[PDB]
Amino acid sequence: SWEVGCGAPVPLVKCDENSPYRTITGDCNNRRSPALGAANRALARWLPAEYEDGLALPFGWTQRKTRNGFRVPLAREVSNKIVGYLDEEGVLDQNRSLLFMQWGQIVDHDLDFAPETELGSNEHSKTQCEEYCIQGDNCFPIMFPKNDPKLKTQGKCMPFFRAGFVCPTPPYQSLAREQINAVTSFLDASLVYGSEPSLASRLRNLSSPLGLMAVNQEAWDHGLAYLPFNNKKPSPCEFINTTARVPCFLAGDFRASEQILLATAHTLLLREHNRLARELKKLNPHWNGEKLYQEARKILGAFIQIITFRDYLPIVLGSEMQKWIPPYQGYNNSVDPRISNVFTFAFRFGHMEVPSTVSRLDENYQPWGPEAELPLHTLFFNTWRIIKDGGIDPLVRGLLAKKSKLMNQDKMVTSELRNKLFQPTHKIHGFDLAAINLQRCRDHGMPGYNSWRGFCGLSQPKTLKGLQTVLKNKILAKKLMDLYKTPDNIDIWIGGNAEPMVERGRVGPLLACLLGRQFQQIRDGDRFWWENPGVFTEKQRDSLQKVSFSRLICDNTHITKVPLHAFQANNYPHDFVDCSTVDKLDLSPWASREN
Template sequence: MFLVLSFKALASEKLTGPDILFSINTAKRLVDQAYKLYRERAKENLRNPHLTPSDFLRHLKEPVAGTRTAIRAASYMETALDLLRQKLQKVWHRRFNITDVLSIQQKDMITRATGCDYLIRPVRCPQNSPYRTITGECNNRKHPHFGMSNHGYARWLPAEYEDGVSLPKGLIQGQLYHGHPLPLVRQVSNEIIGTPNEKITDDQERSLAFMHWGQWVDHDMDLAPMTETSIQNQDVHCDTSCNYTPPCFPIKIPPGDPRITKPGVCMPFIRTTPVCNPTTFIREQLNSITSFLDASMVYGSEEPLARSLRNQSNSLGLMALNQNFTDAGLGLLPFESNSNSICLYTNRTANIPCFNAGDKRVTENLGLTALHTLFVREHNRLARELKVLNPHWDGEKIYQEARKIIGAVNQVITFRDYLPLVLGNEMNKQLPLYKGYNDSEDPTVSNVFSLAFRFGHGSVPPFVPRLDQNFKPLVPYSNVLLHLTFSASWRIIMEGGIDPLLRGLLADHAKLMKQNQMMVEELQERLFEQLELIGLDLASLNLQRGRDHGLPGYNAWRRFCGLSEPSDEAELAAVMGNSQLAKKFIDLYGTPENIDIWIGALAEPFVPYGRVGPLLACLIGTQFRKTRDGDRFWWENPGVFTPWQRRILSGASLSRIICDNTHIQEVPHDVFKMNHYPSDFMKCSEIGGLDLSQSDEN
């Protein structure tokens, strides 16, 4: 105790107000220089004729607008704290955490001077606004930052870092956890995950639309951006470095790797960007989009992006469409304005850039692009119909009303059609009937959910099916290998538009996640592979991401959910229902306590009628309950819509949206269940639609 008090006294003496301000100003200068260098280097990289798989991943996670400001503030704070630590280290030669010795006044000074006080500034919310803000701010009037974009993920359990503050577990070789070292993530991937493309099992009860809707919903709720800016070592290159040099946390390759045999090679990995944490200064990750189910992937989570996505040529409340191409007369998404668009590199002769949408990941795969296109068309269809019914409305009113309906429809489809097929028998337990808005419920997406909801990676098949009007393979474009469709916007323009893709989603199978078939080779070995370049391993990325985020291990989350905690191989075998798999886990991790949350949760047998195990059912169900109950604009909350409007919205369906916005004329009633053509399909005329005639009763 005496040592702590004497150190605090020393810190107070050595870190005066001017000292702290000098460190902050130095930090700002270093950070600004690093960001300038990074931007120049990124531009130079895009002139390179051969992009790496990491370049594609960077593009999908690249921060925009206000996210960049939030990231820079966090960098200012992190760098200033590091400079202050270095200053004290010269006179205090023991190990310490700088945050333990700063006074409340000193912390407040750092928070304000770095701009990190944006997280805690008081907000005055309007009393009677009928529409959501784009950023999610003021959804909760008591806690205006709940669920807002560019804030940190929620923590349901405390973070576990190597140093208690920011260093990821597994960083120090030989370090023991519960008496055992952590295995290399690539070793776990090799021994438990990998499945050759030709050895997968089709899911006989879930369609490809089921898999894609999961990703669609995920992209509505969370995006953890990353930036390769290095403050302390500006010569670091995460593509080539095998050393831990922030922000690089390279994935080391185990001996005898089946694919990567060259010595001294690592798989690149960039840490998720931290967010300011003015309370404890412990590293937290930034969620750059809103936590609400509000269709932010259509409209954006920041005002400048939202405005740029609208059709500014008239006052009809429409979304902007592509000015160069149509899809057999129907609208396509506009192109992004970047002259070095990464999509140009997937087909140099086509010269087609990436599409622009409310979420940066729009062109990650073709099914996702098809859903984005579908909902922008649906917005415009609704806007035109609302204008006819309400000719006195201006463009802003039409835009907001159409946006409100699109958000509600996504909520209906997700809770009525999608989640019951995920959670199975656990649905009613995890998501009891809606009882109304609860302003004490925090809907902020949790850090663990950002990993748990990646369960869908186990249901991705290796091929992208495209079907013709008769639901037969579209020759010659059917069944392209998945890795050849990443960021390939040109395939939408030049290979038949979105109709063939949507038919494939309706009439083809999702992959069945099995304990011996967890992830296809296309994702585990060829992620973002283009041409001859070595692809990334999505399983290794997921495992490394969990450690990057400081997520506790498998048993900690079993305890959180009130489930049993296996303590040895026999008990783990009972939980997994698989003694061979349990042995693999124990051989790798030594104890169930150490198993990385993503792989441990994914490996559990499904709950009855679901597609996740008990642990994932708990984590996913808990998040969606908070997302629903903590949303003031939830479609069922009285006052958001009239009773008549709620009755109409309850009948909304993805089938009808497809009918209304494509040339497809036959659809199944339930798109997420596996359907066979023609026996399980019906004419569009048999599918009910939304009656907007009483869209506004005020």
């Protein structure tokens, strides 16, 4: 029932528990156990992992091994039969902007990243996974079912490499395999500043004592800053247009350029830092770089917490917001702030909120040029469409005046992600994010749908008609029963997402519970939570309480018309007001008085 353990990274970290600043790595957040929520450690297990062999092998690995006496369906077959749809007509969320989806991905990137095995090597390039589609040792290919179009076109499988685990080792025996969280479990803008000393410093402008983040030297946006390029090869952002040869951006998080609207929101977050620093500098010119960096980082960290907890979670969790995140009653050092393995899958509800197209809008919020609208698949790892096609202003306008996809039991994930996903090194727009989510559920040893239903104190359907009642959908139930045979065997990603949405929310009860718990814990278990007595002065928090995503945009673009409520569905001009009408961030209470 208890063991001793193994040590993955640098075992301890001298803490210096005077420092008023979060570490970069998240270490020293918790004084009793300083490793808690620190990056490059095991994700938390809320339930024991479930592997084919009890230890490490995913359900589905060995054909003759059942789960509860039934074969596990191929991930792509589940994708084709349940997740797919043809008709993008009527699929849009009438009361969520496209920024709703985007903030989800941003928060996600702040909280969890489980890299595939050895990010310190490409070896052993035999290759062979993508070529000969042969299973072995952390090559776990997604095999196509009979009658899959991709059969005809792409080969027998989509490549897939198993997630890294502690101890940071390929061969492992004894205990249950535990995947790594490579970012800080704390909601702390790690996606802007990084989660390792190494990347934190490379991101900084040290060359001047102003505590600024590095900016693009090779290009600019009407004088406004771009993130610096990653001059790493092979650059997938170069690969998607070898003519344009415009590389990926360098950010606190390595997924920053995965799509143009994530790269965009990263660009906004960086500018805010530099803006915040330059402001602080003026008020307090006696402050060195370090002090400005940290004080800006600290304010940026709060902005993310507040937009997340005050604006985003209430319209994800809906009725269930109070049940799982009651109002803040201060830091609790007994709460475990770590991101759970299951969260990293629950948060992929976002994938059903991504629509098929992205718009560039002009100052009249009307089509920017004759190619205003682009398919999402052409915008993966696409930086050149920012740099040479009007910078971020047209793209941010689209985040405001366009809609998220609405999650839909007959229209789950757009074919832009479900058939055309680009993965670096693999050359084609030919991958499936849904199939990858399911394979990854199994990779991570996820307990099934009913285990998690029991965890959240909810009924555990055993029959078709039981599942019909919970999904409130005869035909979706029937397809799942036909593929999985028992609700116990349904992968949590698709089980969770199949449930109809709670009142005023965008996730069902199961996900509401799994998400709500995690957000509760990263808040209550955070020493540096913005509302914690002593982190911010009482006046500093009256200033922070007024930030909005509407304000972030006004201060960091040349956009002069915004909604007040950026996550709601907003039509121009009826729901738009001038940037003048929007509460500003008053940095008065940061005025420091000394020698």
